[PDB]
Amino acid sequence: GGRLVVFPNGTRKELSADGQTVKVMFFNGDVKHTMPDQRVIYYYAEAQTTHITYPDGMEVLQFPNNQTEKHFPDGRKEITFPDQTVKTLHPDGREESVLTDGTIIQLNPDGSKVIQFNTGQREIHTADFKRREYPDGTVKTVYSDGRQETQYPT
Amino acid sequence: EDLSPRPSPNPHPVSQ
């Protein structure tokens, strides 16, 4: 079978017979599990937070307010808030939030915003105009100078 | 050889 080691400071280390599974129970309540598949699970007792590191670089954090975060090796971060909104942060600077009703809110580095409503209509906000596309094919644009243009469908 | 715990985590600061 395995082996148990108890350190004078109270930290305990359990090792499986093959040594591929190691569980460290730190004196402060934290727990670290090293698995045979090389993933490392760390539990923070004070913060009640779980942190999983994968061999490919992926990291997952789970908070006690039911917030979860995924840090991808390519730089992408995905946050799932307690209200189940999902916010993705991309390496190129863009941000996308997906609401529970299916609405998508895209923030771009150039200051523009694109909203795709659950209704199929898209709305675009730029420095020069606000534009709303309707699924019947009509488009209304309100320019910065105040003029309003409605394009009717064919 | 070092089995001392990690420091406390913090949620990645969000706008909303």
* Experimentally determined by: X-ray
In chain A, DSSP finds a helix count (H) and a strand count (E) of 0, 17
Cα distance between residue A131 and residue A125, in whole Å: 6
Cα distance between residue A74 and residue A83, in whole Å: 26
- Name the residue among A29, A67, A69 with its Cα closest to residue A53: A69
* Contact call for A87 and B5, based on CB within 8 A: no
Which of A41, A83, A87 would best serve as a mutation to test chain B binding (most B beta carbons within 10 A)? A87
Cα distance between residue A24 and residue A5, in whole Å: 10
Residue pair A140/A149 in contact (Cβ under 8 Å)? The answer is: yes
φ and ψ at residue A63, rounded to 5 degrees: -105, 155
Q: Six-digit token pair at A84?
A: 């189940």
Of the candidates A7, A47, A77, which has its C-beta nearest B3's C-beta? Answer: A7
Beta-bridge partners for A149: A141
Instruction: Please name each of the domains of chain A with its CATH number.
Output: 1-154 (2.60.450.20)
**Resolution to one decimal, Å:** 2.4
Angular region, A102: left φ>0, alpha ψ -120 to 50, beta rest: left
